Amino acid sequence: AQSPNQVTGVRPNGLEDTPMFKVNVNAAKAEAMGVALSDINQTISTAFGSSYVNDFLNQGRVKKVYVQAGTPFRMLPDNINQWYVRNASGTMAPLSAYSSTEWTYGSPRLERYNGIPSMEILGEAAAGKSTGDAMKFMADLVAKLPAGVGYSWTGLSYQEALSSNQAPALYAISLVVVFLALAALYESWSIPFSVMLVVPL
Amino acid sequence: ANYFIDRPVFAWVLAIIMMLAGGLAIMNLPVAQYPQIAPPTITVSATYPGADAQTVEDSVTQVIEQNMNGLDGLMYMSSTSDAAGNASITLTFETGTSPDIAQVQVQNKLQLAMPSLPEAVQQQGISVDKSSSNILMVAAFISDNGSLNQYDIADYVASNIKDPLSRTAGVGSVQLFGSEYAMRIWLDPQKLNKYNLVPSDVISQIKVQNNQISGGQLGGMPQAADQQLNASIIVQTRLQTPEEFGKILLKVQQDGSQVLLRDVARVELGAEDYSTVARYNGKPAAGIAIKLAAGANALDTSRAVKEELNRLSAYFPASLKTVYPYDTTPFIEISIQEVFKTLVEAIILVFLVMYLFLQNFRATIIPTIAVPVVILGTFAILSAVGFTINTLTMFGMVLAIGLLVDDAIVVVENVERVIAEDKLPPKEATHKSMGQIQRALVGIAVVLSAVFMPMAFMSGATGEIYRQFSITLISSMLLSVFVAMSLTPALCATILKARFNTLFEKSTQHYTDSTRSLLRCTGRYMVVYLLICAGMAVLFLRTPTSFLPEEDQGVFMTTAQLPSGATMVNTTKVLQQVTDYYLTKEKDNVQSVFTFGGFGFSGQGQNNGLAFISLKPWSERVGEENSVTAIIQRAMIALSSINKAVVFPFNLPAVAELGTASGFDMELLDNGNLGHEKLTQARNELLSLAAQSPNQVTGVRPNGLEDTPMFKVNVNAAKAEAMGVALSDINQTISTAFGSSYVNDFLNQGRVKKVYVQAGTPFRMLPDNINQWYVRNASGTMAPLSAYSSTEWTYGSPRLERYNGIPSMEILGEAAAGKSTGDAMKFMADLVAKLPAGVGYSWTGLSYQEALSSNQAPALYAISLVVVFLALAALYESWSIPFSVMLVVPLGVVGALLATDLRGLSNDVYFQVGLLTTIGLSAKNAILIVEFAVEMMQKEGKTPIEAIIEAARMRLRPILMTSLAFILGVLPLVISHGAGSGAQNAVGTGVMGGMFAATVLAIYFVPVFFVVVEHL
Amino acid sequence: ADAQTVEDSVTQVIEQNMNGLDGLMYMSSTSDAAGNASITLTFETGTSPDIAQVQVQNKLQLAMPSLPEAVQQQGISVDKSSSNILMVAAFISDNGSLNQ
Amino acid sequence: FLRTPTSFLPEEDQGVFMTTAQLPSGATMVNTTKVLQQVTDYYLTKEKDN
């Protein structure tokens, strides 16, 4: 970002870390009162997640059936206080009794490249500069990073690097081929040498 | 054609293009020890933890078999059900079938059949695998002193080594010899009884508490207006430590004390599969086999794999070393080096023959640069037609070298002779000589192509090897003809300029006067010829038949088998004795011993063991006392006193496809409806009827285990139901206690591992242990399992086999001293017919190949002979002239047969191809002589006798030069007795004994044949 | 499921088996907080898409037993089509009778 | 030749292009819809000629 004359609009192609909610269920207290941990987990998962139950028919097409809590009852961390779990004797006990809530942090999207963790980065080249110059500048910048991080070119950059690397060998092979063709066509080694001196012109 | 003589620059440009294309081909051409020889096979593997052989066969094997239909190119299918709970079905497909298509078809069929299988085998997952067995490296990892056991090494190599590999350029498949980690929970019947618990409760609590719960989202959609919060919810995560598993709450007592898993069981990070003990030189170890890819370079792949292992060695925990048993790179490198050395020595010998006969350095120059151009062009053609660089193709190149030498020698000698006489300038002499031998060269090319085609047009495993050899020879031949017709004339026109002599002149005069004395009573020699012909027949009836000579691969294999019902303690002791012997009595030769106890060749079991012995390099073992065959023949004597094992050493086959070229593989299908006992009765009637006649079959033996004692538990369902105990609970507690119980998966350091529940060791070792387990009533009271159950001892099969959906026995055997394989297969056939009514037989594996393609080579060679005769008739423009050429190649084959008999070798593939090359060269010489005679009859107005004598006189020198060059070019092959000496010795013997007899017989026998055929 | 749960179980289990392919150039993978694993294997030019898909689905069933339930129930999609949109066709309502 | 810049393929005017809007982490769709409506109303008003 502090070198706008070579690369512009460098941005990450990913999502940044976000706060996440954690619920800790006291299995010991739940078993002491009589409610089951499976019931608590299923209640939470169905209330705040979803539950694909069955298929039904609509206008002659098979569609899915989903069970979820209402919109007002899954918007806030305090809404967990509103849910109840049935005991083994039939009495209902609040879910807020045998539970504790807290906040942590976590990444909403994890990316991997060739089997190792990675972060995709996009960006354009500045006015006047080319894609190759931007690629070289990016490689130089990555070289100035903490030890242990590397860089890989992917997508269009892969093909660009391959073409730029493989062009001169193609030039040399084409020159050799045309030289040999001239030597074969005109039975002399003087004509090819007198002709191949014009290529630089 | 002849217009290249006027344009040397065109010929030089063509040579440069050929050399550049050859260099490009060598730069990127796959290399390997052998190509794909075996027909594609697909292996289906299923695991039933704790099941028996009969249970596996009834549940998994039969169900998978019944759905194995609709597969294209299927040849046969064989299934095995073990006593460890393993079902393995191998389906063999026809050669040429795409392995990926066959694999996907088998996988789809099994995928549709999956719901019919029990849940226990669905949980494990049935694996469908391609099979090529082109193992490149068997690199293993060892712990130095005692720190890391076999399971720690196996888990580390599974989680931090396999994934860095399997993605290296040229690596196709990585297979592991070991078991990863698992969460082993060892139950205690007394602790379970104290708390009134059963294994079902433990399994249920593990399933509910080692769970991943999808919490959902706070916020989410649909959401209310002005919502500003949206986060994920975490409820539960899968456990990841043994201590976490030990805190799993099972029940809460009325007192209030919490009952945990650790209160009733021992939780430990153990192994998934405990039934294998892998030791390297006596120390725990785990290994990996790398299987290479298609289109990859076996040299750079090996170098990159070694580099990656060296890089990862810095991350090893402690005292972890990487050894490399069975590396096949040295043999490929040796083959390439031998090919290059043979080429260089052949070039030097050609130079010596030229500056011994012709006495002109300019003459010696031309072949020296002609041969490498053709070799490089052959490499380019091999790359173009999609062929890899293996031992067979390189050996075909080795023979091709002499094939090229012959053409270069004849062309240059003819040009030099036409310069020597008639006082012609080099250009006009080149034009004349090329006019003389153009049609002869074209006819020679066509004849040799027709000769080499039958090897190309074969079928089976042998057909692929013959394809490699024939393609290499044909490409080299055609390119040599093109080069001798394009470049060599131009070089002769441009480069050439206008003691031994006395001896050669005297020899020519001797041949002339011998022919003058002969050609008057040819009839004598006529019948004499028949005598040699007769001898050839008997010779062809004496040489033994073998597929490929066994080579000094540097590794060999020893199998130890305990009698029956023997635990792994005795097998481990036996393997320890074996490795101690191999390491203290052969320390100079043997480098390492890799012993796998609990896994044999006849099936996995506790009474089996295998050992791979790796030897020192050939540079450290020299002579016959330090050879593989001698080493195993010394070890067999010492290991016969192993005290209650059937330990037996042997050498690895040259190719994993097959060995024992004399043995046979047959399966005795039961058919009908007779059971396992009535089939083993037939199998016992045989191996005895066959043993009563040892003049045809020697080693008739069964490839399978025999009946073993088994424990039977009879549960009184009525008594249990009367007492309130459910039969399901009784059947589940025993199964979970004695066999493993796979519960679910957990996360170890980010990798998914299994959780298993089983009883502790001291509680599942004796029949009395079943008296220690209790089951809960419906009222909550525990009662012993010994009340509703009784115990009994029966007999049962620890390994069942099926062939094509029918029970089989797979009685593999061997051939007699000399009886051929076909006679053995025709004896065991109708030996099965003497067996009781109901049974039948099938030939599988090797005997299958010699059951569908048998009368093929005679037809191919008859067609080849007809094509050769037609080509000769077209060349000579007559119907009787070709016979005088066709009746000479037996003289070529007779000497090769005699020499091979003298050396004591067998009818190897290398011998066959060398014999074909010698026949081709003899035919070429005869064709040239007869062409010169026919020309001197057409023009110059001469009788058939004087023409043939003068043609023989003219062509004596090139024949001698080519014979000397080829004979001395294969001389080092015979004298070689080191690494890669089998094929080398075979080709040396064949070529050296064929070429000399061919030339010696032909140079005298051509005129008499010519005059006899012309008279008739 | 969360992003970490998917990336640990599903993404990594499937990715651990995509090794022995024919002309694999490179493999990328994403795991989302909406419960989505998006492995993508880019092969060499000239490779047959049918053969590549066959190999990928052959190696996927070596990891399918290790995948958790509610992931096999929904289904594993193996697609050999292009990864870039060719054309988008939207549908609207003139007056506004039908909603989204 | 050593001073000329390298590239792969020149950029073209295909008649269509894209816009990506990314809100701070932890935001809801109530704000993303407003941001996307702002983008739409800018494109349809300040660039209605193209």
Side-chain angles (χ1 to χ4, degrees):
Chain A
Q2 47 191 58
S3 158
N5 289 325
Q6 301 233 51
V7 283
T8 62
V10 180
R11 68 205 173 281
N13 204 45
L15 293 178
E16 290 89 30
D17 281 13
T18 166
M20 299 174 17
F21 204 42
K22 191 179 191 354
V23 186
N24 305 294
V25 188
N26 217 5
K29 194 183 320 302
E31 191 87 285
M33 311 165 48
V35 315
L37 182 55
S38 152
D39 298 332
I40 292 157
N41 291 346
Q42 287 172 347
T43 281
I44 299 166
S45 181
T46 300
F48 287 86
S50 280
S51 206
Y52 165 65
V53 181
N54 262 127
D55 288 357
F56 85 110
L57 266 283
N58 198 229
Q59 269 156 283
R61 213 179 198 251
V62 281
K63 309 184 150 96
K64 318 215 236 161
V65 175
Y66 274 90
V67 166
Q68 197 172 13
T71 299
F73 310 108
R74 53 175 166 77
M75 287 306 128
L76 288 191
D78 322 286
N79 279 348
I80 299 171
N81 294 352
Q82 304 188 336
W83 280 97
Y84 289 72
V85 193
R86 196 164 62 234
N87 192 344
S89 311
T91 280
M92 301 265 288
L95 175 57
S96 85
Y98 32 73
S99 82
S100 211
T101 88
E102 80 202 357
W103 287 96
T104 81
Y105 264 95
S107 194
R109 202 185 100 134
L110 298 181
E111 328 166 55
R112 314 188 51 105
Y113 188 79
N114 276 343
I116 56 200
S118 96
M119 286 218 199
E120 176 169 19
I121 283 141
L122 302 183
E124 277 139 352
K129 306 306 211 141
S130 281
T131 315
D133 308 331
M135 287 180 74
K136 206 192 323 290
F137 181 72
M138 260 309 113
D140 295 358
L141 270 192
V142 162
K144 317 199 320 220
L145 276 191
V149 294
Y151 79 96
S152 275
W153 294 119
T154 176
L156 207 53
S157 274
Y158 208 82
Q159 319 292 329
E160 184 168 313
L162 259 49
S163 159
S164 316
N165 271 43
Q166 301 187 339
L170 181 54
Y171 298 148
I173 270 164
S174 287
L175 264 154
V176 170
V177 159
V178 66
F179 181 97
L180 292 176
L182 267 180
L185 188 78
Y186 302 133
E187 322 276 349
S188 187
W189 303 103
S190 292
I191 292 147
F193 270 97
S194 310
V195 166
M196 289 305 127
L197 290 190
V198 174
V199 181
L201 302 186
Chain B
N2 93 94
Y3 95 119
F4 280 96
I5 308 164
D6 278 320
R7 340 209 193 287
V9 185
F10 209 157
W12 265 118
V13 159
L14 282 188
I16 287 169
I17 294 263
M18 229 173 294
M19 286 175 28
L20 289 197
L24 261 60
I26 297 176
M27 210 153 287
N28 42 286
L29 250 195
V31 316
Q33 181 147 272
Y34 291 97
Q36 194 56 44
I37 287 173
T41 69
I42 303 303
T43 309
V44 173
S45 322
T47 311
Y48 201 161
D52 314 328
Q54 192 67 61
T55 295
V56 163
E57 207 212 23
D58 300 341
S59 304
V60 188
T61 299
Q62 281 209 43
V63 171
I64 292 182
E65 256 160 20
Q66 286 174 11
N67 288 115
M68 268 318 113
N69 49 58
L71 317 171
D72 48 28
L74 181 71
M75 272 168 24
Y76 49 86
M77 146 179 81
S78 35
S79 316
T80 279
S81 317
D82 290 279
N86 299 340
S88 267
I89 298 105
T90 298
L91 315 101
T92 305
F93 289 87
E94 302 201 346
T95 313
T97 312
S98 183
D100 276 291
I101 284 305
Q103 157 151 66
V104 80
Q105 294 195 126
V106 164
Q107 181 106 56
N108 285 340
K109 292 271 143 205
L110 164 86
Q111 235 185 37
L112 295 166
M114 204 87 68
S116 287
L117 297 178
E119 274 276 357
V121 307
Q122 291 185 62
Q123 255 180 336
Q124 305 285 319
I126 301 105
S127 53
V128 175
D129 215 20
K130 269 174 316 171
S131 283
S132 60
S133 210
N134 86 236
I135 298 187
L136 170 87
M137 311 190 27
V138 153
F141 303 82
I142 197 193
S143 90
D144 270 339
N145 33 68
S147 34
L148 317 184
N149 37 296
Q150 154 195 351
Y151 315 121
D152 303 13
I153 300 159
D155 178 79
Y156 185 75
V157 77
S159 92
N160 322 51
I161 299 276
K162 262 185 55 124
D163 284 33
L165 305 174
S166 268
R167 90 161 53 105
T168 289
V171 179
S173 161
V174 171
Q175 186 220 342
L176 211 158
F177 305 140
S179 57
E180 318 170 18
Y181 272 143
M183 190 58 59
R184 289 317 213 122
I185 290 144
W186 312 106
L187 301 176
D188 195 308
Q190 303 121 30
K191 308 271 208 48
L192 287 176
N193 196 1
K194 189 170 51 213
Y195 301 113
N196 294 346
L197 294 172
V198 282
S200 319
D201 304 354
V202 175
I203 294 178
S204 301
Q205 297 294 343
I206 296 165
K207 292 196 98 132
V208 64
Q209 305 207 42
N210 179 32
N211 215 348
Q212 169 79 221
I213 290 309
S214 309
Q217 283 205 341
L218 264 197
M221 301 275 298
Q223 76 211 314
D226 71 49
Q227 175 77 19
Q228 309 285 329
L229 164 75
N230 164 65
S232 313
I233 303 197
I234 319 173
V235 180
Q236 203 159 63
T237 307
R238 298 209 294 233
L239 300 180
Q240 53 196 3
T241 76
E243 298 85 11
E244 256 178 327
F245 271 87
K247 275 141 94 193
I248 283 176
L249 176 90
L250 297 192
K251 80 185 289 206
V252 157
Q253 323 221 54
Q254 293 153 299
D255 173 1
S257 324
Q258 273 154 30
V259 179
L260 308 190
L261 186 50
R262 79 160 78 100
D263 288 322
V264 313
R266 216 184 64 234
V267 194
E268 155 197 310
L269 205 50
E272 306 182 351
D273 223 357
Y274 267 109
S275 72
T276 282
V277 183
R279 302 261 178 279
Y280 180 85
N281 282 338
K283 309 320 287 194
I288 42 175
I290 295 106
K291 263 166 201 76
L292 207 69
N297 205 28
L299 299 188
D300 318 311
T301 296
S302 179
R303 207 172 38 223
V305 163
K306 268 152 190 291
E307 195 32 72
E308 262 210 20
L309 288 173
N310 164 247
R311 174 189 47 109
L312 304 163
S313 93
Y315 283 52
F316 286 0
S319 50
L320 207 56
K321 321 214 148 296
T322 304
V323 314
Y324 304 89
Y326 190 65
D327 194 342
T328 74
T329 288
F331 324 126
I332 325 181
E333 293 180 350
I334 287 186
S335 149
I336 272 157
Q337 288 201 345
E338 295 313 82
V339 168
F340 181 76
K341 195 178 142 274
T342 286
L343 163 76
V344 163
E345 301 194 350
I347 275 188
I348 279 161
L349 260 159
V350 157
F351 172 90
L352 283 195
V353 175
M354 301 285 248
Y355 201 139
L356 159 73
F357 276 80
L358 276 196
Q359 313 144 310
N360 206 6
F361 177 65
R362 341 277 306 269
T364 85
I365 270 178
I366 300 124
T368 288
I369 54 198
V371 167
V373 172
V374 192
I375 287 308
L376 285 166
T378 301
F379 268 124
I381 292 156
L382 275 199
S383 147
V385 307
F387 260 90
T388 204
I389 292 175
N390 47 277
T391 51
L392 320 168
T393 41
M394 290 314 98
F395 177 65
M397 201 86 48
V398 172
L399 302 184
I401 282 160
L403 265 173
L404 320 190
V405 156
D406 195 332
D407 306 346
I409 284 296
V410 47
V411 173
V412 182
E413 182 285 355
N414 208 166
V415 171
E416 257 278 4
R417 197 211 64 207
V418 181
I419 300 198
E421 41 186 298
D422 212 359
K423 303 324 156 217
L424 272 186
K427 195 139 167 270
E428 279 98 337
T430 313
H431 274 84
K432 194 162 177 330
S433 147
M434 221 55 47
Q436 300 198 59
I437 65 170
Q438 260 172 320
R439 337 180 57 252
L441 278 199
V442 183
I444 283 169
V446 172
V447 161
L448 293 196
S449 169
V451 164
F452 292 135
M453 280 285 158
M455 269 197 339
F457 290 130
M458 301 258 190
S459 46
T462 307
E464 304 207 79
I465 305 168
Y466 280 153
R467 257 172 23 86
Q468 321 276 322
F469 283 130
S470 79
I471 291 310
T472 307
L473 293 162
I474 276 163
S475 316
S476 295
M477 191 256 288
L478 287 192
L479 190 45
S480 93
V481 171
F482 174 77
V483 156
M485 260 163 89
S486 96
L487 172 55
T488 320
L491 283 185
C492 291
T494 282
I495 298 183
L496 277 178
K497 69 161 191 153
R499 312 191 291 137
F500 167 75
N501 209 234
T502 315
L503 313 185
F504 182 60
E505 220 165 310
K506 262 196 180 313
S507 155
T508 56
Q509 180 46 231
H510 150 66
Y511 173 76
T512 310
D513 70 38
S514 95
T515 313
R516 202 175 331 123
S517 208
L518 269 40
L519 275 191
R520 291 314 193 194
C521 56
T522 167
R524 288 175 45 195
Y525 272 30
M526 199 78 262
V527 80
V528 157
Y529 167 74
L530 259 76
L531 294 193
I532 290 95
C533 160
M536 171 255 288
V538 84
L539 265 58
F540 207 82
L541 225 58
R542 195 130 269 148
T543 302
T545 315
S546 197
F547 200 17
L548 301 122
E550 297 88 47
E551 320 259 8
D552 207 90
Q553 279 177 129
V555 317
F556 58 106
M557 292 235 308
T558 312
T559 84
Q561 174 128 13
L562 294 214
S564 179
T567 71
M568 191 95 88
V569 175
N570 316 341
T571 291
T572 297
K573 289 196 253 252
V574 157
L575 286 155
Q576 185 76 285
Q577 303 297 298
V578 156
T579 185
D580 257 347
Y581 161 73
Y582 268 121
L583 269 189
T584 204
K585 285 264 157 42
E586 303 216 29
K587 45 169 54 59
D588 304 278
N589 317 348
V590 164
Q591 167 136 61
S592 84
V593 194
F594 207 173
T595 44
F596 294 99
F599 154 70
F601 263 123
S602 171
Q604 183 155 269
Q606 265 179 77
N607 57 353
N608 293 306
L610 212 64
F612 314 150
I613 302 108
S614 176
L615 284 161
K616 287 282 211 324
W618 318 263
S619 88
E620 305 215 10
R621 323 170 288 113
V622 287
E624 251 319 283
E625 290 254 29
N626 290 351
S627 151
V628 155
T629 317
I631 274 171
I632 81 160
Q633 88 165 59
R634 299 147 69 179
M636 191 175 318
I637 304 303
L639 293 189
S640 270
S641 54
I642 271 291
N643 188 38
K644 214 73 191 293
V646 200
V647 48
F648 169 68
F650 59 78
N651 194 356
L652 267 193
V655 53
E657 151 56 50
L658 72 95
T660 168
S662 44
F664 65 96
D665 210 16
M666 86 169 291
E667 315 239 6
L668 180 80
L669 323 179
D670 82 332
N671 278 313
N673 205 204
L674 72 172
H676 181 249
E677 310 87 0
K678 273 195 65 180
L679 179 61
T680 203
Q681 277 167 30
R683 196 215 46 174
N684 282 333
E685 289 214 1
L686 192 143
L687 281 68
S688 151
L689 260 73
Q692 279 164 18
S693 46
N695 50 1
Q696 315 164 293
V697 284
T698 84
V700 185
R701 64 171 180 310
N703 183 56
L705 308 171
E706 256 204 65
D707 282 16
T708 63
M710 292 199 157
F711 210 51
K712 200 187 215 137
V713 182
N714 301 301
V715 173
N716 232 28
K719 215 180 140 82
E721 257 281 352
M723 289 336 276
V725 187
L727 178 70
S728 159
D729 286 2
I730 306 194
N731 279 349
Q732 282 179 324
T733 63
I734 308 184
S735 160
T736 295
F738 290 78
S740 43
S741 208
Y742 172 47
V743 177
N744 47 26
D745 285 354
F746 84 110
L747 271 183
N748 191 47
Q749 311 211 69
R751 275 212 151 66
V752 164
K753 314 294 200 163
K754 310 196 190 262
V755 179
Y756 276 92
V757 167
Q758 201 189 355
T761 309
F763 310 108
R764 58 168 158 78
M765 295 277 117
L766 293 161
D768 193 68
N769 288 132
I770 322 186
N771 290 355
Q772 303 181 351
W773 282 93
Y774 287 61
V775 284
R776 204 182 20 217
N777 304 357
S779 86
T781 292
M782 308 266 295
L785 168 60
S786 83
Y788 328 109
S789 88
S790 94
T791 65
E792 181 211 339
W793 276 96
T794 78
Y795 264 94
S797 191
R799 186 165 145 289
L800 297 166
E801 317 162 52
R802 301 165 77 82
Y803 191 69
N804 275 326
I806 283 282
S808 89
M809 276 275 152
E810 201 208 0
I811 299 128
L812 89 172
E814 267 265 13
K819 265 302 278 193
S820 97
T821 298
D823 297 319
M825 307 182 15
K826 205 211 90 73
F827 177 45
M828 308 283 324
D830 254 12
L831 180 56
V832 167
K834 302 293 161 33
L835 287 205
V839 307
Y841 72 110
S842 285
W843 302 103
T844 182
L846 266 40
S847 306
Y848 193 85
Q849 321 271 22
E850 337 172 309
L852 266 279
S853 83
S854 39
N855 317 95
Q856 175 95 319
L860 298 160
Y861 282 124
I863 290 158
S864 189
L865 226 51
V866 178
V867 177
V868 161
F869 171 70
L870 291 185
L872 284 178
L875 170 70
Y876 294 132
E877 312 271 28
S878 150
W879 291 116
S880 50
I881 308 286
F883 287 128
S884 69
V885 176
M886 303 214 68
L887 292 186
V888 196
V889 289
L891 301 188
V893 67
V894 161
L897 262 201
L898 297 143
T900 308
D901 286 340
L902 253 62
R903 182 118 185 134
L905 301 184
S906 42
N907 250 36
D908 311 279
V909 169
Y910 308 100
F911 164 79
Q912 266 82 242
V913 57
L915 189 134
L916 266 176
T917 307
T918 57
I919 280 142
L921 282 188
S922 86
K924 156 151 185 314
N925 287 339
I927 281 171
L928 271 169
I929 284 161
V930 174
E931 166 91 350
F932 272 84
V934 156
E935 266 173 29
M936 271 195 308
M937 251 169 302
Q938 269 170 310
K939 55 195 309 302
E940 299 219 1
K942 215 166 299 175
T943 60
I945 319 163
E946 304 144 66
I948 199 63
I949 321 168
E950 216 270 2
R953 154 151 61 261
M954 261 184 325
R955 306 260 337 132
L956 188 62
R957 213 178 50 178
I959 276 160
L960 288 200
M961 280 196 304
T962 58
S963 295
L964 248 68
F966 208 2
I967 282 166
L968 295 206
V970 306
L971 190 125
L973 301 167
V974 154
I975 83 188
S976 69
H977 65 145
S981 43
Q984 265 199 130
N985 227 335
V987 54
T989 305
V991 171
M992 155 166 256
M995 192 69 253
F996 184 63
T999 167
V1000 163
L1001 285 193
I1003 55 174
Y1004 289 77
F1005 259 101
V1006 156
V1008 305
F1009 277 130
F1010 186 78
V1011 294
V1012 173
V1013 190
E1014 181 46 3
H1015 221 76
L1016 268 60
Chain C
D2 320 331
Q4 183 90 61
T5 285
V6 178
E7 201 258 0
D8 263 297
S9 322
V10 186
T11 284
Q12 272 198 233
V13 152
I14 301 174
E15 195 193 85
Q16 270 161 225
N17 302 58
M18 311 275 148
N19 38 19
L21 305 167
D22 199 314
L24 197 51
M25 277 196 324
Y26 49 86
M27 159 188 56
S28 305
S29 156
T30 85
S31 310
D32 222 317
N36 274 315
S38 201
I39 305 107
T40 313
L41 309 111
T42 293
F43 291 79
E44 202 103 25
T45 315
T47 320
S48 286
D50 314 291
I51 277 304
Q53 196 186 24
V54 155
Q55 283 173 337
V56 165
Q57 70 192 248
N58 285 338
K59 262 157 216 67
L60 207 154
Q61 298 287 339
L62 262 43
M64 201 85 155
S66 311
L67 287 179
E69 288 265 328
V71 190
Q72 327 164 316
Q73 179 209 33
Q74 302 266 321
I76 272 284
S77 303
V78 184
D79 279 308
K80 66 178 192 59
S81 91
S82 159
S83 46
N84 282 38
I85 288 147
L86 155 80
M87 173 189 13
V88 164
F91 302 84
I92 51 145
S93 161
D94 285 340
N95 42 66
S97 147
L98 330 176
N99 48 66
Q100 172 200 4
Chain D
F1 196 88
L2 301 173
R3 290 213 276 90
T4 194
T6 84
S7 164
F8 187 41
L9 280 189
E11 232 174 359
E12 309 276 27
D13 187 306
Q14 326 215 5
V16 288
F17 65 102
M18 311 215 67
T19 304
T20 42
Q22 179 150 348
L23 267 68
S25 87
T28 43
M29 181 95 58
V30 175
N31 309 324
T32 312
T33 299
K34 298 191 311 225
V35 160
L36 279 180
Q37 178 80 25
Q38 294 189 40
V39 173
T40 282
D41 263 358
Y42 157 75
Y43 273 129
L44 291 181
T45 291
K46 286 216 188 333
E47 297 255 55
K48 41 158 78 77
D49 291 344
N50 318 310

